[PDB]
Design a protein around this ligand. Structure first.
Ligand code: Q7A
Ligand code: Q7A
Ligand code: ZN
Length: 257
């Protein structure tokens, strides 16, 4: 029932999901002058060499690439994290215009899109159990700006025609997510939530400072996806982002000076 339209969008979600007005909701605005460098943070460890991608799917709210998480193959460790977090999927949020689309903002600046690489804490055994824990998930968030093409994104964009409508999936094996990463792993981190229903407050957010550049042609392909299912009137999948939520009693920590 929930979505991104006028009658089912973010301002309505609290009725079905009262945690929408909770104490650690995401996304947030990252005020760069107020985020404090934390020298006790460790460098991120992003170990994606053994990643096994499986499928790509249009779920009616985004498109998502899934991974085999039945073994420690592609894992996120270090930084603010205790223990090992397994990559299980990535997806994006994007806009109808280049000046909007990201969920997190930086000094109120919105990027054209935001990539979420979703990982779960292996101490909880499965992702469903992890989402019930305050430290169950770690999401690596990466901003997209429009400029030069990102070569590592092209294989994604070229398959989107085959998953145009809600409910479509396709094989998407042998995709290397290392090609989506910027050079620097400098990051901000804070405790938050999923940015869609169920809005569970289970995420350690790790948002990279350096955006990746993608071309106008790449992002235009995102905007040709459909929220609707096959054999229905086209409603373009655009502006599938939740706006910044109140920071409340939280501090955003920077890994860098
Ligand atoms: O699309 C997804 N939805 C989820 C929900 Cl609703 C709850 C828990 C985990 C997931 S997920 O990250 O596996 N992929
Ligand atoms: O829209 C989002 N939904 C999520 C779900 Cl349902 C599960 C895991 C992580 C996410 S997310 O917060 O990265 N962005
Ligand atoms: Zn997301």
């Amino acid at each position: 029932h929930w979505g991104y339209g006028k009658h089912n969008g973010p301002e309505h979600w609290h009725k079905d999901f009262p945690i929408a007005k909770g104490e650690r909701q995401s996304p947030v605005d990252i005020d760069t002058h107020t985020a404090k460098y934390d020298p006790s943070l460790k460098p991120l460890s992003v170990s994606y060499d053994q990643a096994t991608s499986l499928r790509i799917l249009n779920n009616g709210h985004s498109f998502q690439v899934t991974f085999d998480d039945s073994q420690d193959k592609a894992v996120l460790k270090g930084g603010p994290l205790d223990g090992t977090y397994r990559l299980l999927q990535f997806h994006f949020h994007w806009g109808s215009l280049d000046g909007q689309g990201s969920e997190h903002t930086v000094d109120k600046k919105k990027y054209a899109a935001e990539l979420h690489l979703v990982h779960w804490n292996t101490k909880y055994g499965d992702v469903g159990k992890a989402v019930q824990q305050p430290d169950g998930l770690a999401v690596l968030g990466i901003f997209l700006k429009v400029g030069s093409a990102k070569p590592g994104l092209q294989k994604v964009v070229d398959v989107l025609d085959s998953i145009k409508t809600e409910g479509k999936s396709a094989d998407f094996t042998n995709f290397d997510p290392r090609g989506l990463l910027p050079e620097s792993l400098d990051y901000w981190t804070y405790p938050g939530s999923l940015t869609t229903p169920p809005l569970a407050e289970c995420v350690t957010w790790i948002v990279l400072k350096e955006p990746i550049s993608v071309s106008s042609e790449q992002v235009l392909k995102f905007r040709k996806l459909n929220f609707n299912g096959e054999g229905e009137p086209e409603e373009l999948m655009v502006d599938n982002w939740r706006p910044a939520q109140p920071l409340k009693n939280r501090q955003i920590k920077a890994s860098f000076k």
